[PDB]
Structure formats: structure tokens, C-alpha cells
Symmetry: D2
Subunit: 228 residues, 4 copies
């Protein structure tokens, strides 16, 4: 258990990749705090069945108010967040001539602001303790030619810039900041369909002390399609 | 005259790199339209000295209303915009601990929303004429370890995402979308400081027929410091 | 023990990073085969102390004859090779105006040909077993402005192309091919302290495990956050 | 006439992209020196028709003797070499299990050594005069998942490393070193149409001109917007 006595936060952790990472971290000894719009009964039962503590909060991660309240709550309950996984995000297909400023803005609020708001809430606790991990979810579409995702790819690129820049800011405090880039769901080197479990090993590795000298990096886990 | 009979819009073109690019484009034969919060007397004089037309409009490129008005004025005055240079942007140094959500948002509104708003205003005209050029200014800090620029580097990264994704959406309309990455102003291969004129060649190149098959790319002009 | 019942080959494993990776792999439960110019008594003792099998062979990894002989010996001795770490390499500083074709050629033979020769020797066995891991050591100097390394950086870039192209070739065989980029032996890093061999071992073990079965053709920089790519 | 009174050398300039670059440089005012295994009658005609001087030398760019002799002849003929375009190279499709060390080696000798040998030949003069442009041709396959090109992609990656490292070595001497990555020749590109030699000339002329004095160590992909780096 590489994450023993650690409290990990996963946004959008009620389902999909978010939940997969949450459980993997729990398996590795970490207690869990999930922030999402919908309830996470499944994740909660699986995590508790592992003997781990878990808290689920209904929250709109794009709203400063909800994130501040979520942060206070997580701090009151577990006292501190050691690992922050910014997984929350939307990816609607929208042709450029139909893309409105409102849709564009909404995409940034959910995909980018949430990671910033969450960092503001938990970095202080990490700095005080001299150890921390922040993992941002980006996308391989960042390196691919694909239409109707101008708003989406712009935010995913922002996630990488956020990762690199924040890593520079927090590197002296024992905190690493990295990103994981899954495919958006032949062109891959490994002819296998991607599944959430394919990303849990990388997340666990990055959140462990086996990667303490690794920060500001983006690790693509996609069967070898993109190269960077 | 690689830019003969074309109207180029340069946001934040009153000074610095924006101004240098505007004048070079004029030298190449293009009429100019500048969007900025301040007047551009020096720029106008240089452009008119080249026998080219110029229009400078007081405009807050981050505000939908201003951009929409700016767009109608440009179309009414020149009929169309063939080249859009999204150069406008702010880059204040702000340590993460000091960085607020308001400053974070403001940085995105100026550095990222502007490019989207301008594209929405001028892409229709380019598509109709079957030719267009959009050049986004980003920053080499995107690949550098430098503190106090989490907000800034996140937008600079978004600019690249925007470049790559929009390039894919408009590639079939005869419009190319590229980005130029100047350094922020020993580590360089070329031992001398960067000056505005070092970037004009690349901009004129990307805006001409010599680069009609180049799109979605990011060109670094920094004396050989970053490599990507 | 994620590497239990695995035979891992480490080139240039008698010292430094090579030796460190070999020992960590042994800790993970794998047996070890070392190819190097000099003997590896220290590494062998540490590996045996962990209760693992270890073989060291005098070998110039740039010579096809040597590598071929090394391959046969490893296969005979362990039955197979599941993990190949192409660590071997040199990095002499040589100003361009002083760099000769002989030196340039020598740098490629050791730094690039070794990895190719080692792959030709162990890939068949991996393909047959339907599982394999190849890890190539490159360098962050690949993304850095630094003089007197035109030969070195050229080979380090080649290591990456090799990594990417071979990953494509073997993607259907259950074999992944990735690279690790350490800094070349403070204020320029996000993490201030100096890099130590142990900083790379965690990354090597991860890539060699099932935790990275869907990861291939990638280059992982472990340098305290200096380079970004 | 951005290249007015310059002497440019283009390896493999008898046909395809090489020739296209040669003719464009001639259009921009430069005299031409071509190194290739075959004659360039079509190229020589067009260039002389542009009012420019041209020299074509039967030459195997992978051999030190040939290159050294080519350099002396170019300097002896024009008294200078301001621009070097390392365009020569081969790209045979070869599955990994069939790729031999000999094939691997030959691919490096032609695709990589040639660039080095030409630099040693012309860099001294560029440095002495304090102005120079070196342009290396690489390939977008460097960033693409594609099989049977392990040898090829490894050399194309070497070209980028060479470009980056040499740029650092020559940056203080008024010399820039950059690379152009054309696609190896529809819906995979942002601009659907097929790539043609002319698509690369604009970038070649740009980099070799004074419009790119502050650009060095970079790789410019010209492929219709397929790859992104």
C-alpha cells in the first residue's frame, strides 16, 4: 500500500475514470473524498468494502462557492488532502460554426476553473505538510487532428499548461503536479480498446513516492497512438 | 507584396510585437485594422507612410460586445478581414499563493476569449472567400520552468490548443491556423536579446502563400532556447 | 513483487543507473542478466543477497558478434528474456570543431546500435511468449540548449525514434517499448535537489510492470521538472 | 531576391523535394550546388533558365571521401557556401523481423552521417564569414504510429537531435540550424489534399533567409496539419 494514511480527492469520481482512480487509490491504502454532481453510492460501497474511509459530496466543481464549501468539509472530516485528482470535465462534440461563446465559456468553467479552484482549496494543506500530489486529466486529442472540439481541446491544452506552471510553483514544497492523457472515447500501436483500468496504474504511480522526482509532465496512456 | 490587397486585423497592435507585425504586413501590401484599448499613433504613421490604409478602434477584445462592434466596423470599412492576428494578451507575474479566481478569470478573458471572439467575427468572411489566415501569439514559457505564471502559462497553453483544434475545423475552408511563440521579455543558442523585429518574418511567412500547407503548428522564435 | 518470474537484461548494468535499475528489478522479484565491459561483483552480490539469480557477461554491446553471443547465453541460461533495459551508452563532451567522424561513429555504435542489436536478440523470444518490455535510456539534453554534444544528443534523439518506431512494430505482440529521460550527469528544476539513481528506478519498475501495459512509444522525463514536452 | 548572391548546397537535389528547393532558392537569387548519385539535367536547365549558376556532382553523401571532395570542389568553384540543405536520404519499408544490422547501418550512413559530413565540410567557412543556414530534412513519421520503419524513424529522429545540438554549437557564429518535416509520401490531415514538393519550398526559403535570423534548433512540420508538436 503505497498510499497508506493519505487522503485523496477525486473530482467527477462518481463514475468512469474518476471512480476507477478513486478505488485504485483506496486499494493502495488511501481514504477518499469525492466531489461530483451525482451521488456515488457504488464507489462508496466498494471503497468501504476495502476498509477505507470515504466521503461523497454533491458539488458543482466549476462554482467557487461549492468548491470552497467542499474544501472546508474535506478538511473538517479528514483534516487534510494529500492527493488531488482533477478528473471532472465535459466533452460535447460541437462544430465551430455552432459553438457559442456561452458553450465555450461553460466548457472552461467545468474543465479548467475547477482544477484551479480545487488547487486553491487544498494546496495550502499540502504545503504545510511538505508533501502533495496533484494529477490533472487531459486528453490525447490535444495532439490529434479532430473536428468539432475547439472548445474542448482548448481546455485540455489549458490543463497541460496548468500542470506545467503549477508544478514550477509548488516544486519546492514537496508537491508534484502531473497530467495523464487518455484517448477520447488501428491508429494505436496496441490493438486494444481503452478501459478505465488502463489509467489507474499511471495515476497510482504518479501519486506514489516512486515518482517524487517527476513533475510538470504529461503521460499519455493510449495504446501508443500519440507520441510527444 | 505577399499580402497584396488584403486586410489584416492585429489585436493589441498599438505597441510591441503587435505593432511590429502590423507594420511588416503593411510593407507586404496589406491594409491594417487594429483593435486595442489605446490609440496607435506610431503604428498609423508607419502604415500610412507605406501608402496603406489603417483603422484603429478602441476596443476591449475580451468583451463580446466590443468585438462584435469592432467586427461590424471592420467589415463595413474594408468589407472583409483576410488575416487575423490574435496578439492581445496580458502577462502579470503573480505567485500562486497570491493568485485569485478573479485574476485567473481576467487573464483567460483577455488572453483566450479574445481569440475566440475575433475568430467568430472574421472566420465567416474568410470561409466565404475561400482563403484565410489566423495567427495566435503564445509563449515559450509554455515549455519552461518559471514560477508565478500559472494563470499566464495556462492561457498560453490554451492558445495552442485553440490553434490546433481550430486548424482542424477550418482546414477545408482554405484557412490555416498557426501560432508563434516568442520568449517572454546563456540559455539561448543565439546570444542576444530578442527584439520585435525578430518575429515579423515568421508572421509574414505564415500569413503568405508560402505557408498554405502549414496549419495547426506552433513556431518558436526565441534564439534557440526551447526545442519541441 | 511486480516482476516475479521475470528475466531482465540490463546493458551497462555494472555501475550507476544501470546497476541501480538492475537491483531494483531484483527487489521486484526478477532475475538478472547484465551485459557490460567490466565485471559486476557489487551488483551480483546485492542481487544474490535478495535471493535472485544473476548472470554477468563481458560484452561490448556495440559489437553484433558480442551481442549475439550474449543473447544465446542469456536464453540458454534462463530460457528467456522478458525485460530489456538498453542503458549502455557514453557521453563524452566534444566541441563540434573537434568532433571527428570516428568519434561520431563510435558514439552511434555504442549508444544506438547496442539497443538495436539487443532487440534483435531478445524480441523473438518475447513475441513468442506474447509479453515483453523494452526500456531505452535517452537524455533530457534532447530538449536542452547545450554545447559540445552534437554526437551525443544525436544518438539520444535516435533512441527516442527507435523507441517510437519499435513500439509500433511490436504493439500487437504484447510488447511495449518506452524510454526514460534522466538529466545529464537547482534553479532550473522545479524540484531543487540533485538527481540520484533511485529517482529513475521507480519509473523503470513501473514501465516494466503490468501497470503500464497500455503505455507504449512514450518518453518519460525524470528530472525534477526541468524539461516539459 | 532574399538569397541574392548566396551559394546553396542541396544534397539529393536532382529530384523531388530536393530539386524543388534548389529551383526555389535559384528563384530567390542563389546559385546552386547539387550533390547526388544521379545527374540533374532537368534541375540544371531550370536553374540556368533562372539566370543562376549551377553545379551538379556525382556523389555518395554517406562516404567521407566523397563529401570532403565535394566540399573542396564547391568552395573551389564558387568560393563559398552560405546555405546547406541536407535533403539526401532513403526510406525503404522493412518489417522489424526482416531488418538486418547491415540495412540498419546503411540507413544511418545515408540518412545521418551525410548530414554530419556536409556540416564538417561547410561549417568552417560559414563560421569564418559569420553567416550560415543549415536545413535538415526529417519526417512527420517521427510523431506517427506506423510500422516497418524502425530504422528509418530512428534516423529521422537523429536528424532532429543533430539539428538541435548543432544549433547550440553554432548559434554564436551567425549560423542557424533548423529542420523541415514533410509527410512521407487525406482525412488524417486538416487540409485534405496530397502534399507536393512545392509545399515545402516556402518553408525552405523562409528559414534560409534573414526573415529567420532568430530561429534556430527548431523543427517545422509541413504536412497539411496532421501532426501537432
Amino acid at each position: 500500500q503505497r498510499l497508506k494514511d493519505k487522503l485523496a480527492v477525486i473530482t467527477g469520481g462518481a463514475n468512469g475514470i474518476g471512480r476507477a482512480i478513486a478505488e485504485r487509490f483506496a486499494v493502495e491504502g488511501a481514504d477518499i473524498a469525492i466531489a461530483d454532481l451525482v451521488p456515488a453510492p457504488e464507489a462508496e460501497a466498494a471503497i468501504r468494502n476495502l476498509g477505507r474511509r470515504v466521503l461523497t459530496v454533491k458539488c458543482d466543481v466549476s462554482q467557487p462557492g461549492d468548491v470552497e464549501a467542499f474544501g472546508k468539509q474535506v478538511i473538517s472530516t479528514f483534516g487534510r488532502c494529500d492527493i488531488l485528482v482533477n478528473n471532472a470535465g465535459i466533452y460535447p462534440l460541437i462544430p465551430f460554426d455552432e459553438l457559442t461563446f456561452e458553450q465555450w465559456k461553460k466548457t472552461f468553467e467545468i474543465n479548467v476553473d475547477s482544477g484551479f479552484l480545487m488547487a486553491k482549496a487544498f494546496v495550502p494543506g499540502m504545503k504545510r505538510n511538505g508533501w502533495g500530489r496533484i494529477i490533472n486529466l487531459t486528453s490525447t486529442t490535444y495532439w490529434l487532428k479532430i473536428e468539432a472540439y475547439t472548445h474542448y481541446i482548448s481546455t485540455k491544452a489549458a490543463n497541460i499548461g496548468f500542470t506545467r506552471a503549477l508544478a514550477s510553483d509548488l516544486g519546492k514544497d514537496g508537491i508534484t503536479v502531473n497530467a495523464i492523457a487518455p484517448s477520447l472515447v488501428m491508429l494505436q500501436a496496441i490493438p486494444r480498446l481503452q478501459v478505465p483500468l488502463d489509467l489507474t496504474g499511471a495515476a497510482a504511480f504518479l501519486a506514489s513516492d516512486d515518482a517524487s522526482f517527476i513533475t510538470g509532465q504529461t503521460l499519455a496512456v493510449d495504446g501508443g497512438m500519440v507520441r510527444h
